[PDB]
Amino acid sequence: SIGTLKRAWIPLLILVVVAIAGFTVQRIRTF
Amino acid sequence: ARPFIPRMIRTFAVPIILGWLVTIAVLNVTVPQLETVGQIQAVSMSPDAAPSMISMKHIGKVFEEGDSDSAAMIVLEGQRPLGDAAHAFYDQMIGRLQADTTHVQSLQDFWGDPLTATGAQSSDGKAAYVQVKLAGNQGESLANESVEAVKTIVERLAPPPGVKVYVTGSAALVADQQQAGDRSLQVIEAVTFTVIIVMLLLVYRSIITSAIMLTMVVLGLLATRGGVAFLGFHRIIGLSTFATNLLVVLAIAAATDYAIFLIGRYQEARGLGQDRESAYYTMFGGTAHVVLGSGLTIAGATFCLSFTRLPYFQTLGVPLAIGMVIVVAAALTLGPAIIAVTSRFGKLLEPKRMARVRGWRKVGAAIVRWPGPILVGAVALALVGLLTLPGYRTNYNDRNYLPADLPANEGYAAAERHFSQARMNPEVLMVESDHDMRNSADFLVINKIAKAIFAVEGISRVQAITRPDGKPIESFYLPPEVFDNPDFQRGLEQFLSPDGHAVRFIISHEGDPMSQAGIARIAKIKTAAKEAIKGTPLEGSAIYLGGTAAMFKDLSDGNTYDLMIAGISALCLIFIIMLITTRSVVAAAVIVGTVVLSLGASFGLSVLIWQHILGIELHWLVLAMAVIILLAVGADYNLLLVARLKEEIHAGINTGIIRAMGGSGSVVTAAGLVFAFTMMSFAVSELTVMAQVGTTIGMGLLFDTLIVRSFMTPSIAALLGKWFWWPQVVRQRPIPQPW
Amino acid sequence: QFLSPDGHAVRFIISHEGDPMSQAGIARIAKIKTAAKEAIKGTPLEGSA
Numbered sequence: 095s096i097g098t099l100k101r102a103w104i105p106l107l108i109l110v111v112v113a114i115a116g117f118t119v120q121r122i123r124t125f
Numbered sequence: 126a127r128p129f130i131p132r133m134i135r136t137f138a139v140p141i142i143l144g145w146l147v148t149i150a151v152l153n154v155t156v157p158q159l160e161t162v163g164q165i166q167a168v169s170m171s172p173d174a175a176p177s178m179i180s181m182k183h184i185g186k187v188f189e190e191g192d193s194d195s196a197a198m199i200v201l202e203g204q205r206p207l208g209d210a211a212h213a214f215y216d217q218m219i220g221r222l223q224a225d226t227t228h229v230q231s232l233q234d235f236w237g238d239p240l241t242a243t244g245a246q247s248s249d250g251k252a253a254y255v256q257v258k259l260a261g262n263q264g265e266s267l268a269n270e271s272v273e274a275v276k277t278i279v280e281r282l283a284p285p286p287g288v289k290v291y292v293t294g295s296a297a298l299v300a301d302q303q304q305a306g307d308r309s310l311q312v313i314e315a316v317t318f319t320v321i322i323v324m325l326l327l328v329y330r331s332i333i334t335s336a337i338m339l340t341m342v343v344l345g346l347l348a349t350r351g352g353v354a355f356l357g358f359h360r361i362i363g364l365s366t367f368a369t370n371l372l373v374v375l376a377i378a379a380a381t382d383y384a385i386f387l388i389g390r391y392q393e394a395r396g397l398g399q400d401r402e403s404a405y406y407t408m409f410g411g412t413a414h415v416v417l418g419s420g421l422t423i424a425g426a427t428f429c430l431s432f433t434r435l436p437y438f439q440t441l442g443v444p445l446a447i448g449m450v451i452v453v454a455a456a457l458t459l460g461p462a463i464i465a466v467t468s469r470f471g472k473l474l475e476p477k478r479m480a481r482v483r484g485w486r487k488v489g490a491a492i493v494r495w496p497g498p499i500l501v502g503a504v505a506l507a508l509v510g511l512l513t514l515p516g517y518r519t520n521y522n523d524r525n526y527l528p529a530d531l532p533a534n535e536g537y538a539a540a541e542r543h544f545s546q547a548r549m550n551p552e553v554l555m556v557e558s559d560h561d562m563r564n565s566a567d568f569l570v571i572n573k574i575a576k577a578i579f580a581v582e583g584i585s586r587v588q589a590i591t592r593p594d595g596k597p598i599e600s601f602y603l604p605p606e607v608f609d610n611p612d613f614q615r616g617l618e619q620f621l622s623p624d625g626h627a628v629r630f631i632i633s634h635e636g637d638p639m640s641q642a643g644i645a646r647i648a649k650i651k652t653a654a655k656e657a658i659k660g661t662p663l664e665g666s667a668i669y670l671g672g673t674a675a676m677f678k679d680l681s682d683g684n685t686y687d688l689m690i691a692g693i694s695a696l697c698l699i700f701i702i703m704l705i706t707t708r709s710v711v712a713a714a715v716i717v718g719t720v721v722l723s724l725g726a727s728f729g730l731s732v733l734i735w736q737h738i739l740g741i742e743l744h745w746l747v748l749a750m751a752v753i754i755l756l757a758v759g760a761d762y763n764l765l766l767v768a769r770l771k772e773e774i775h776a777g778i779n780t781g782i783i784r785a786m787g788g789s790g791s792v793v794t795a796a797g798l799v800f801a802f803t804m805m806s807f808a809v810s811e812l813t814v815m816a817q818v819g820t821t822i823g824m825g826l827l828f829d830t831l832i833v834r835s836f837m838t839p840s841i842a843a844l845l846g847k848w849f850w851w852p853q854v855v856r857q858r859p860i861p862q863p864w
Numbered sequence: 865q866f867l868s869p870d871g872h873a874v875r876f877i878i879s880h881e882g883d884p885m886s887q888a889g890i891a892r893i894a895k896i897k898t899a900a901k902e903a904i905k906g907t908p909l910e911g912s913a
Binding site: 545596 | 902906907911
Binding site: 103104107108111112115118119122123125 | 432434686689690693694697700701704705708710852
């Protein structure tokens with residue numbers, strides 16, 4: 095819901111950034 | 126009232142100081158120093174599964190000449206063409222070298238063979254050479270003592286009159302470069318010591334405060350070094366010389382950063398008019414979380430650096446993180462403790478005069494009132510920095526980055542004096558087929574390969590079974606009876622696998638084999654060698670290419686990919702920490718943009734100064750070290766400044782800017798200049814690569830502190846306004862209070 | 865006509881295709897020089913002018 099989503103936007107944003115960074119680093123590493 | 130942690134730190138000050146001292150003592154007396162423990166367990170710098178390394182191991186395995194890739198050359202020249210006594214002593218020496226099976230694995234006797242002697246002798250018949258395969262890979266100590274042993278065994282016996290013997294190659298080069306760095310250490314340390322003392326007395330205008338800071342820094346450095354050597358001594362974690370050096374540099378930088386942070390905040394608080402106790406409590410409550418966050422961000426980034434594939438960064442991940450954690454722990458426990466003890470006992474930490482805070486408040490006033498034009502000026506300077514970046518070249522030859530008195534350099538000089546190619550850095554090509562090659566048609570194909578290789582733009586010699594002197598430019602015929610001449614059989618073992626399933630040609634470049642062209646040439650060598658067999662029965666065989674240029678091409682590719690991995694990791698972690706600290710999504714983005722822009726401008730200025738003007742090309746390691754240190758220090762300073770700015774927002778956006786400038790700009794500037802000049806004092810070293818790294822970091826921090834951090838980000842903050850703190854809602858000015 | 869009277873030189877007379885004074889014609893001469901240099905490489909004429 096709105097409240098439980100906007101009351102914790104920081105941790106979710108960090109999770110998204112870490113996920114993207116991990117995916118990109120994994121893909122680059124295999125080269 | 127008073128938080129738990131500072132009260133417990135200060136109440137137990139003396140016992141914790143004693144504990145720190147005794148721990149450092151025990152960790153430094155019972156466990157050797159970092160240089161020794163690092164050298165005993167050094168690791169090879171070439172990746173384990175690179176295309177070149179596998180080729181060298183396989184080539185060694187097939188011909189039964191060891192499993193290593195270290196090699197050296199012996200140069201034999203005289204002022205008169207060599208005679209029979211030359212052969213006599215050459216044979217005696219070669220017997221002696223073959224007697225010592227401990228250190229030399231296998232040998233390549235060309236000059237002793239009449240058929241191939243032409244290919245192992247100068248055009249005027251005045252010089253010769255030999256190849257020795259040595260124990261241990263590159264960079265392991267085994268190679269070092271093996272090359273030293275060969276030097277001793279060759280120099281024990283006196284050469285005949287008229288001739289002189291050298292030792293040459295890459296192994297001797299690395300051994301002597303290690304010795305040269307060790308020699309330069311003393312002078313460089315003396316000069317940097319005097320410069321750092323001068324700078325500290327200049328920043329503080331006192332002798333006692335400088336002495337106390339030196340104490341903080343040395344205790345932190347000794348603790349970090351002892352602890353990391355303790356962990357590495359028991360084979361708990363890996364170590365390497367590059368790791369120890371960068372660890373020392375980072376330890377010094379972080380320790381001085383935090384020491385200046387704490388003492389400056391203390392003195393500022395005292396100047397405001399608070400008593401000793403409240404000054405201590407406010408410095409802790411204003412700097413502790415910043416120090417902790419910066420330390421953990423740097424530790425996390427330097428740990429994430431460990432996923433890299435190139436060992437130069439792989440081995441560098443754990444030890445630096447452990448050292449950084451130790452540094453932050455020491456500077457959070459021991460720091461405030463001794464500050465409290467020193468403040469209480471007598472009268473030592475005492476601010477005198479006030480001339481920097483007022484000046485920096487004035488600079489903040491200028492930034493706030495006219496933020497636009499100052500921004501365009503700063504970005505214009507960054508532009509003049511950036512525009513020289515795209516033209517950037519790099520050189521992998523390490524010969525011409527050292528003084529010319531190293532013995533290997535005289536060996537190289539002799540070789541260049543009597544040879545018109547780069548015959549001291551050859552290569553080897555291999556073809557692995559599935560049938561015996563000791564027959565005529567396969568020889569025609571072999572010669573086809575040799576000729577196809579010879580015709581590449583850059584190659585000068587291609588030494589093969591067909592032509593031992595290395596000029597395959599002729600039509601070929603060898604009747605089958607030639608397999609019975611014993612001399613031909615000896616050459617056959619030298620050049621063909623004993624099973625008959627492999628061939629190898631020795632390829633020597635022209636010019637420097639390690640410049641960019643010498644790196645791009647091996648791909649063409651492989652393509653030509655592949656297309657030469659196309660259509661002949663040998664199709665589908667496996668082609669190996671082992672040599673120095675191959676190794677350096679692999680290293681360059683790994684270098685670019687690892688630089689990008691580390692960049693993404695570091696930048697994303699900076700984003701995370703700024704977001705946690707400020708609770709703003711635009712502020713973190715602005716900081717990320719500014720830091721990357723500063724890296725770019727700094728390196729642009731450095732390349733403008735070092736390659737265009739002084740006419741010396743940068744190394745292939747400067748980028749990595751420079752970016753590591755610059756990113757760490759920038760994270761630290763930006764975190765402090767932004768945290769302070771957030772602290773002073775409540776009374777208006779912009780008077781907060783000028784207050785924050787007065788409070789913290791001076792501290793960050795002092796730390797930046799001290800570290801920058803401590804590094805800049807390295808320009809007088811005779812190991813030019815260290816001069817390059819030191820000067821790059823120095824000029825980079827000068828530009829960062831004096832242009833970017835003091836004029837670009839405060840101006841941006843004052844320009845955007847309340848939109849620097851989105852999504853948080855803030856006000857440009859408080860409610861208008863009455864008179 | 866071709867060799868030098870003292871016998872220390874030779875000259876070749878080279879004619880282009882199309883328009884010698886367009887961009888390609890200008891670019892061709894470096895290739896000519898490189899080709900000659902690589903042709904003399906390894907032979908007793910190596911390093912000549």
